[PDB]
Design a protein around this ligand. Sequence first.
Ligand SMILES: Nc1nc2c(ncn2[C@@H]2O[C@H](COP(=O)(O)OP(=O)(O)NP(=O)(O)O)[C@@H](O)[C@H]2O)c(=O)[nH]1
Ligand SMILES: [Mg+2]
Lengths: 206, 994, 127, 14
Amino acid sequence: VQFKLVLVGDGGTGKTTFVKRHLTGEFEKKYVATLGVEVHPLVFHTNRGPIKFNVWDTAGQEKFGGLRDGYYIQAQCAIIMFDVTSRVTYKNVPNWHRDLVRVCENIPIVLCGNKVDIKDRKVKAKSIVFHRKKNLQYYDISAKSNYNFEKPFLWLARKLIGDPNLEFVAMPALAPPEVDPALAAQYEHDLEVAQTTALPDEDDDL
Amino acid sequence: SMEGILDFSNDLDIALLDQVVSTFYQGSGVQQKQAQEILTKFQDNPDAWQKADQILQFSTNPQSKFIALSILDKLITRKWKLLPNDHRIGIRNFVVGMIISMCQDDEVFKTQKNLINKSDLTLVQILKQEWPQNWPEFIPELIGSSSSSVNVCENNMIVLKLLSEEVFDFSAEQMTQAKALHLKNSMSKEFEQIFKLCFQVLEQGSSSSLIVATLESLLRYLHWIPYRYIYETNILELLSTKFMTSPDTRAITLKCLTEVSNLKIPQDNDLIKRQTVLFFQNTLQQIATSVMPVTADLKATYANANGNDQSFLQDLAMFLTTYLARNRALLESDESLRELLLNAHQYLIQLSKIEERELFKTTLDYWHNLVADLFYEPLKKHIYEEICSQLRLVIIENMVRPTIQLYKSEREVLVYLTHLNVIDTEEIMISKLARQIDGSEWSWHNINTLSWAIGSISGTMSEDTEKRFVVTVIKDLLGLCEQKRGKDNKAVVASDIMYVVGQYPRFLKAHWNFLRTVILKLFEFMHETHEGVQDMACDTFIKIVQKCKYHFVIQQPRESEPFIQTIIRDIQKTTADLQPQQVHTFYKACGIIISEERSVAERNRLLSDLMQLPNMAWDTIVEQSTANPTLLLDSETVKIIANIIKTNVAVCTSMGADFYPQLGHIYYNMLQLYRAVSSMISAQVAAEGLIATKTPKVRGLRTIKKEILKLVETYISKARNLDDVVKVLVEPLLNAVLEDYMNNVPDARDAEVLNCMTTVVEKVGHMIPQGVILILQSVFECTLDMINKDFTEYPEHRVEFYKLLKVINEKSFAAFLELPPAAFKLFVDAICWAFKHNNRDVEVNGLQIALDLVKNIERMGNVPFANEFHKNYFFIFVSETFFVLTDSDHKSGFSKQALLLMKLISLVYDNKISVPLYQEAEVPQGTSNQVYLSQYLANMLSNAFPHLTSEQIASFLSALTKQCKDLVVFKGTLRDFLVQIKEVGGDPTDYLFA
Amino acid sequence: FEPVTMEEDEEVLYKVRAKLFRFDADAKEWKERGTGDCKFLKNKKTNKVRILMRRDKTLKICANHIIAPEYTLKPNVGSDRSWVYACTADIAEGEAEAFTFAIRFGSKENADKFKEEFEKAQEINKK
Amino acid sequence: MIDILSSELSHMDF
Ligand SMILES: Nc1nc2c(ncn2[C@@H]2O[C@H](COP(=O)(O)OP(=O)(O)NP(=O)(O)O)[C@@H](O)[C@H]2O)c(=O)[nH]1
Ligand SMILES: [Mg+2]
C-alpha cells in the first residue's frame, strides 16, 4: 500500500531538510547538496490504514542533476518546492513543473513556499499564483518551525486514496520494557560529552 | 558486478542494462542506491550517446530507452553542431523511425505513453537545431502523414504542442534572441497549414484521444497566433458547444476559452464583440444543461471530490473571472444579456462558498475588481444589487484573523460593499448577531468571525449611523457575555468586545466617559490570570492609545487632570501581575501619549514620572553593582537590569528625539555597565572556555550589552539634535564598544556592535571623520578575518560587516583614502569576496559597494589616487564581475552584476580614465585603453572558455562594448553569451541582433 | 420506525509542552526528535509509570520508555530549563535502543516542576 | 444611551 512521491525544486529551497523532519524529527542547519536522488520510505498513520510514501528527493543544483527527468517515471504524486526568500526559485517553478508534467501526465501535485519563518520574505503571497491555472495545491510552509509541514502529505493522501475525510491518527503506544555494569562505564562517557554540549537554538521558545 | 556497463572497452550488455535500470526503479535500499550511482555515471559518460540506437532497438525496458533518449537530448542540446554532418542526419533518422515504429503498434502506443512523449521531445530538440533551414519539408510531410493513420495524427499534435512550447513559452533564456526570433518566424510562416489540419480534426471527429491531443496543442497556439484564426473562422462555435458536452475534452476546452477570453479585442469592432458574447453565452448554456444548474451546491461537490470535479470547478472559476474582468461591459448594456450576466456571477457566488483557501483568493480577487468598478463607474451598481447582497453574507461568514494578506483583501472588498449599501450590510450583521444570542449559530469560530467583520467596516458609515450601530453591537455582546457561565466562554466574548471598540476610534474620541471605562477595564484585565487575557488587554490598550493619543494628553471637561497622569500614578498597581514584556508594551504605550505633549517642560515631567520605577531600580543596581561587581553573576540581578534597559528601549521607541532627557540620566552609567559586563564575560571565557558563551549566565550578560546598544541605536536613529549626538554621545560610545569588540575572541564579539556603528555613520557619519576612521581600524580587519575563510561561519557578523562598509563608503568615503595601501587592498578583497556569496543579504551589498566605489573614484577627477586605483584594481573588478556572471551559481544577482560591468566598460568608452591601464612593455606605446580593453577581455574569455571560437568572443565583446549605454540590450547580450557558453558551435552572428 | 491508540489502560499524572533532543556521539551533536505534549502515564493495572511524547500534527511517537528509578537528571551547560539523562530502553522507533536524551521546556519553572513529577513517578516505579 | 453602555461595560466579571 505505497505511493511514489517526487520532490523537486531549485537548490537550497530545503527539500532534504523537509524530508528529514518527517523521518528523524531533526532540523539540519547545514546545506549539503544532494547528489542525484535519495530515496526514503515515509509512513503516516491514518484512519484508513498506514499509508507509505516513497519519497524521491531530487537534486536542485544542475551540476548534481543526475538522471534529471528520469527520476519522474511512474511517479504517482509530486511536490514542487521553492524558497519564499529567493525570487529566482519561484521564477524557476514553471520550469520544474514543465519537466514534471511532461513525464507525469496526470498526478496530484503540491506547490510549497518554504522558509516562511524568515522575516525578510521576498516572494509575497500576492505574487504566488502559478498554481491557479496549473491546478496545483499551494501551501506556505517552514521546515524550521513546522508551519504547515504536515499539510502537503495530508492533501496528497486524501487524493491518492480518494477520501477527503481522511485524517492523521495517533499510532498505538506499545508498553516499553522495564530494564548491567559492563556498559555502565561507556554510557556515562557518552553522557559527560552530551551534558557539556550546549543545546542548539537556546533562544527558541521551545 | 553491476559496474560492467560502465566499461566501454567491450560491447554494451543490453541484458545487463535492463537489469541495472529495473533495480533502480523497482529496487530498494542499498541495491537501489548502488544502481543509482551507476546509471548516473553511465549517462554522464561523454561517449554514451553512441550506444543510444542500440538501446532504442534491442532493449525491452521502456525505462532504458527513456534514459537513452536523455543521453541524446544532452548531445543534441550541447554538442550537436560539433558532430560530423553524417551522424547528425543519422540520429534524425532512427529517432523518426522509432516514433513511427511505436505509432504503428497499437499495443506500444497505448502502454508506453511516457516513452513516446520522450521521443517526441527528443525530435523537437533536433528541430530547434535543424528546422527549417535543413528540413524545409517537415510540416508539409507532417500534414500528409496525419491522414494515413489516427495514431500518427494524434502523436503529431503532441509534437506540434511541444514545438510551440519550446519556441514561444520557454525559448527565452534557453536560446539566443536570434535563434528564438528565427524559430518564431518559421512557425508563423507555416501556421496556416497547421490550423487547417487542426480545424479539420476538430470538425470531422471523432477519436477522443485525438481530439484532446489536438485541443491541448491549440491551447499553446492561443499564446501567440493572430486574432483572425479565432474570429474570422467558426472555431469558437465548436469550442463553446461541441466540446463542452463530453467530460474528457471539457477540461481542456475550458482552458482554451480562458486564453481567448484574456485578449484585449479590437474595441471598435462590432463583430468580434458579438463573437465574444456568443461563445460565452454558449459555454454557460452547456454547463447549465450538461454539468450542473445555477442553483447547484458547488461547495458540497468540491468537498466530495468525485473524479475531476475539483479540477473542473477551479477551471470554471478561472474562466468566469477572466472573461468577466475583460468583457462584462458587453453584457451590462444589452437587456437581453442581463440573465446571462447574472447567471455568470451566480456561479461565482456558489464557487466562493467552497472551502478552499487558494480557490477563495481567486474569486475574491475578482469581487474586488467588481465592487471597485461599481464604486466608481456610474449606472452599474443597480445591476448587481442581488449579487452584492449575497456576497456580503459570503465574506462576513469567511472572515479571517487580522495569513494577513487575505484579511486586508476581504476588508477592502467588504468596505466597498458597505458603501454600495450601508443598510443591507448593517442588517446582515445584526441578524448574524441575533442568531448568535439564541445559540443557533453559536460557536467560538463564528462569534470571532462575526466580530472581525464588524470591525473591518470601520469608518465606512456616517458618524451618527455608526453610533446607533456600535451601541447595538456592544449591547448584544455584553448581554452575550452575561449569558455564558464558562470562564473560557466569557474570555472569548470579552476579547471580541475589546477588539471591536479598538476598531472604532472615532466613537471613542467623541465619548470620553465611555473611553475611560474601557481603559479602566483593560487595567482590570491586566490582573486577570486566564491565558491570553493579559496580552489582549495590553494589545488593545496600546492599539487605542495610538489612535486616541490626543484624548489622554489634554484635560477632559469632567476630569481634574489629563488622564495620562492618572495612569502613571497607579502604573505600578496596574502592571503588577504582568510579564516583563507586557510591562514594556504598557510603558511603550504611555510613551506614545507623552510624545503628544508639545510643551517641553510638561513633556519632560511626564517622562520623569513614567521612568520613576526603572530609574529607582537602576540607581539602586548601579550603586550595588560597582560596590560588589560579583552581583552580575546573580541571574535575578542580570534579569532586573535587562528589563530596565528594555523598558528604556520601549519608551524611547515611542518618543524618539523626545527621549534625550531620560537617556542622559543613565547614559554615562549605562556605558560604565557595558564595560563591567564586558570584563565579566572575558573573565568567564578565560576561566571556563568558549563554551561559556553558551551558558545561561553569560547569555544574560550579553543581553545587557545588546539591549544597551539597541537603546542607543533607537535614539540616534530618531534624534533631531545631531549636534548633541556628536558632542555628547559618540565619544563615550566608541571608546566603550570599539576596543572591547576588537580585543575579544571572535566567538565573544557581538555583531550588534557593527549594526550600532552602522546606525551612527548613517546619521552623523558625515560629521565624524576621525570617528569613522576609528571605527574602521577597530572592526574592519578583525571582522574580515572571521569571514574570509568560508561562506557559512559567523552569518550575523557577515551581513552587518558589509552594511557598515556600505554606509561608510556612502557617507564618509574619505576614511578609505586614509587607509594604508595594504589595508585598502584588503578592502577591495572584501568587496569581491561579497560577490561570490550565494547569500543575497551579502551579494547585493557587495555589488552596491563596488558600484559606489567606482563612482567615488570617478568624481575625484584626474588625481594620483584615482589613477592608481584604476591601474591596480580596474581589471580585477572586471574579471571578478565576469566570473560571478558566468559561473552559473550567482544568477540571483544578474541584473546588478550587469549594471556594474556596464559601468566599468563605459569608463573606457568615454575616456574617463586618463592614465593607461597597462605596462609600457606589454603593449606598443600609444595604444588606447579601448583597444587594450578588448585585448584583455579577449584573452580572458579564451582561457576561461576554450570551447568558444575567437570569432564568438570578438563578436560578443564588439557588441557588448558598443552597447554599454543601453542596459536592457547589454543584459540581452550577456544572456546570449550565457546561452552559448553552455554549448559548442555558438553562432557568432547572434550578437548582431540589435 | 427503524432508524438509520494504546492509552486506554493508563492515567495522566502530569502533562507539559516540551522539545526533545537526542545525542549523536558519532558526530558529537544534538538532534531534535520531536516536539509536542510530554505525558506521564500510570498503568492502572501494573501501577508503573512511563513517558509518552508525541509530535504535533503527525502525532508520531518520539519517546516511549519507563521512568526507571535508576535514571538521573543532569543540567545542561547551555541552559537552566533543560534536563539531560541516559535511557537504556526506548521504543519510539521500534526496537529498544539506548539514547542520551535531553528535554527542554518553556521556562525554568516547567523544568523544575518536571523534575518534581519525574521523581514522584520514580517512587511509584519502586512500589 | 451611552451612559448606560458605559455602566454595562464596567460590570464585566468572570
Ligand atoms: N530558515 C529556514 N531554513 C531552512 C528551512 N528549510 C531548509 N533550510 C535551510 O536550507 C538550506 C538547504 O537545505 P536543503 O534541504 O539541503 O535544500 P535542498 O533543496 O535539498 N538543496 P539540493 O536540491 O541541492 O539538495 C539549509 O541550510 C537549511 O538550514 C526552513 O524552513 N527555514
Ligand atoms: Mg538536498
